[PDB]
Amino acid sequence: RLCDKLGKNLLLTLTVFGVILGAVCGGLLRLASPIHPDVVMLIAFPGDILMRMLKMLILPLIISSLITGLSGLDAKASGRLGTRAMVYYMSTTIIAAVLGVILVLAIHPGNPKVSSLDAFLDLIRNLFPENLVQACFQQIQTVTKVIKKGLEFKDGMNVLGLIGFFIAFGIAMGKMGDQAKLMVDFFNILNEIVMKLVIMIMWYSPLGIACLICGKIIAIKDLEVVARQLGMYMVTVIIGLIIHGGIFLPLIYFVVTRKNPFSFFAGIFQAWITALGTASSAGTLPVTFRCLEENLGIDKRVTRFVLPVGATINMDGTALYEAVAAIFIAQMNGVVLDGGQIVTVSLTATLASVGAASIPSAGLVTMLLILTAVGLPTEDISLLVAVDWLLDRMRTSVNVVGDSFGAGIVYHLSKSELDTIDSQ
């Protein structure tokens, strides 16, 4: 009977067993004498290997998936009803992401543990990288060294510049139409290969996460503050999800559609419960189809377009979670983030929540993308993974609720056009 439960989710059960084993081994080694830091380095080495493996692939993913999605997936044959959905998604997700950054900088869960103008000028300068091979590992930083300001070259990937340039590249390829089909197919092949590599690497994730946990449990001064930091991080994420799902999305539905959002929740309550249970938008998709069709009575076309694409492109709770987690790792490491990196994380949270289900088994890769877009030490992911089992259900329910409200909004903004088409 146990096999029928564990085997069907072998990767998840392996990761859970690895986390438990790493935590208990870390506790046992903590019960021992203060360990030689080289022995800790050997212990936490497979985690370093996993982090390096994933950070090796964070580059080809942003090179290829942006091009493939912008060129290939974006088809305007859906007409205005398509755009009314798309402009919704990239609008609500940011509202989520910024909200997280507002909350985590207000609560500062881990905090107890250059001017802003130059920071924003540096943000804009790194957003247009004057070189493209040097934007793969180097950003430009303004240094006042002591009144003549200059621009030196930092070390760290320039995620924003590459993302901007390849968004432009994908848009141009899409505008070429069919004459660029050869390169569209080439980059689609590269994307499939890189996703195969990500899946292949993530099978090694159990042992890497186990070693990361066993290397972080040993090297903390006292658990009495780390446990409180993690608890406040959970509190921040849950408060953000509540504020987004229960106050912001109903406010959008009220201001745009001007229909009672509480009736909408009464309709999609079954979908929300099924999203909490399944913890997957794709699995919950039939339930939300049934709810929005037979309960709210919205048009079949608007649902049939919005829901299948909103379940993979519109995830709000994941964006808020990733923003809060990146800022929490920044604060817990003592790294205070300026106004040029807060916007960087608040944009990479969006651009990594877009691809957190469009690319299977890429949550860790997206978290590392966010943590390396702001130059942070990417070794504290272990604390996130040790707790990223209760938040997943809530942040999936928030995504499903966001998709439902997107379907409602798009239907209410295109009812006249659909009626006119159906009349003929």
Place this chain on the structure above:
Amino acid sequence: RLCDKLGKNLLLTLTVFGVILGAVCGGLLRLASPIHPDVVMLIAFPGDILMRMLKMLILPLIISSLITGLSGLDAKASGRLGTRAMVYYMSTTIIAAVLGVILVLAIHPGNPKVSSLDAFLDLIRNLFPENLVQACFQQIQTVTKVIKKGLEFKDGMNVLGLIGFFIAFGIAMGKMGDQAKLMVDFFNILNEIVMKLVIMIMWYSPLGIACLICGKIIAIKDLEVVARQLGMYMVTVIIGLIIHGGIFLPLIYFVVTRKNPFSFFAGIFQAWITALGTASSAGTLPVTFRCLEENLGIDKRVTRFVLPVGATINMDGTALYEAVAAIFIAQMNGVVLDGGQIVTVSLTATLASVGAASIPSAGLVTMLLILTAVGLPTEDISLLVAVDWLLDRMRTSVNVVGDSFGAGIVYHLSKSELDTIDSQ
């Protein structure tokens, strides 16, 4: 009646209005107190963004346009005659570029404002870059540090190494014939995407150039010396164009063809006037067709090949202009150029005059390619653009004259072969 003039050339009129607005705003701010240099940095920021965009695009252009041109365009179905044109172009253009580099180093318009052996060895070393990913942003510089000479890695793109390697790459691809079509098409698609990006960016050029002008007017010591420097630069370009069009090209026609070049000039006078009026070789191409066909009576085939390809590959006046302008920017900044960078600019001027009309709206990109091949500060282009409205007509006229003399030379070097073919 005004829209019939401004509307047709919307980009040109936008750039002119931007330049005028930037100049008048700079004058007004100059009438104010010495401004905080940070306020100047904010003022001159959109120009910085434009230069960063263009310098971002200078890499894929030399990666892809060289491949597309050498592999795709070069087809020897034209036979010996085709070579008799090509070896002409890449010769006379150089005769232009070097000439400019001489004149600007004899007049030194902006000057008042390591041994050469090691410099040439450094030129040859950077011509064969031992690494290709490190040649995208780093050149090798010889340092005597104090008798044991060594080689360190400077900062700045290695334009010569990339150009040489990809000339070899394109030549090999062309020698593969049809078996390499699947990558010829890939690089052609990439070239079209990059050209679309250049056009898209150059629509932002008005605001960037306006801000560059308004940030350069404020931050100069006195307008007198700058105006004199610009006047001397324009005089140098005029002298170079006169010496090339009126003395060098007739000398080539005399030494090779041994026919009176003044009769040729009398014949192509109409084409020269129409080139001055139109300021475009492509628009003057029908006029030079008619002139060279019904006035000089050269063969139809030699004209039909040379002129359509010479109007886009053979521009000598543009090469002389670009060499003189790059050296003038070097002299204004006080950057004295050694014998390893003078050859660099005198080669990049040729390789940019080749692609200054094969790629629409890529003149600024070519100027930045030349200014970054020799490690110069790319912020003085505004001074060039302030005066680059009277030199355009004259350099276009010189290009058209060069194409006409190339047609004459090629016809006189293939009359026997054409006669033998026509006899059968």
Place this chain on the structure above:
Amino acid sequence: RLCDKLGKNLLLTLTVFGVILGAVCGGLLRLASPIHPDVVMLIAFPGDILMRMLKMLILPLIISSLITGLSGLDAKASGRLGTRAMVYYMSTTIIAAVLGVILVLAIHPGNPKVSSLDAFLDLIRNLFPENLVQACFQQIQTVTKVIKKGLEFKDGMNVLGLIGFFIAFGIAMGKMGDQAKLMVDFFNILNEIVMKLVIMIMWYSPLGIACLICGKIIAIKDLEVVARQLGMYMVTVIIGLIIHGGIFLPLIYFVVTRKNPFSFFAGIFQAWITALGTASSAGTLPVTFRCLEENLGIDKRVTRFVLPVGATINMDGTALYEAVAAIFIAQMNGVVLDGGQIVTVSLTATLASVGAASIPSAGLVTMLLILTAVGLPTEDISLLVAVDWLLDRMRTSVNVVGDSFGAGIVYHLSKSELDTIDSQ
């Protein structure tokens, strides 16, 4: 009668004449006064150009040949009999490689002329490069700077990380099947282009090698130690070949097949002699086919598969030679190699003995790949080429013997399957 000998091998005779001319000119200049080191730098400059050319081409070769071989060449239509061969090759070659590294570090031909744990951890870190554009020119090195260990970015190509990533990439390409054809063809075309470039550059090899030889002869202290160093290096290579082809391969045949290996030698004696005479596995291939078929009586299928692919993938003597030569250059320069670079050279020798005949005229490129994978000065190759005319015959003989024993081993490990197939 002389042209019938020199003309057929024009590249080989050109290289020999260049070596002789460079050596005699170096001797004559040695008879002169101590020369200005700048004159020596000028003399040894074409050799520097050749080294830079080849080191420029070592990157696209490992980018493209790995993909082309792992994806394209590896076809499992040969069934298990294929794997029984392949697992043999990559296991014999390593034995050939490591053995060389054992002898050269034991004999240290040129020697008279960070802990190991951190070295191996640095090996593993450089084998998983956290960045893929920074892995093209930079490795990570552990520095104890003075108890808090850190990781700083060294300078030098990260050959191992790129090889590992692109082995993974090619394996994924091959596993994804026929949907990757549009990119397999792209990389095959790129590989053929780069092979054409390697052949084109290697035609310039005579003059570069002559200048390298002259520059080395001019700039060494005394021949009394250099001649002894080269003699000991040749003795080490010969000892390694004798041990591998006389003690190790017969031991493998005895332990696996349990048949008298001396009878196997008696069977392939003609093949061994023809391999020594021809100094080429491909030319000897008909002779070893005839010997193994009509003398040992092994199955036609096993021979017809193993020999044609073993002649181009299984060269053991070349791996031993390259490992010994790289370590000999390391010792002769006074560069002591740690345990993290000994494994690097012992793996790059294996991965460059595969591509030492799969890519014609790429022996120098493979030697430079090995010498730059361990951060060595690539100017001592001339002293290898001065003696690399007697060792070629012996290493070719060892390669042919290895292929013959591979055929024997694979036949004895698949006799039952072949008999069962033939019975039906």
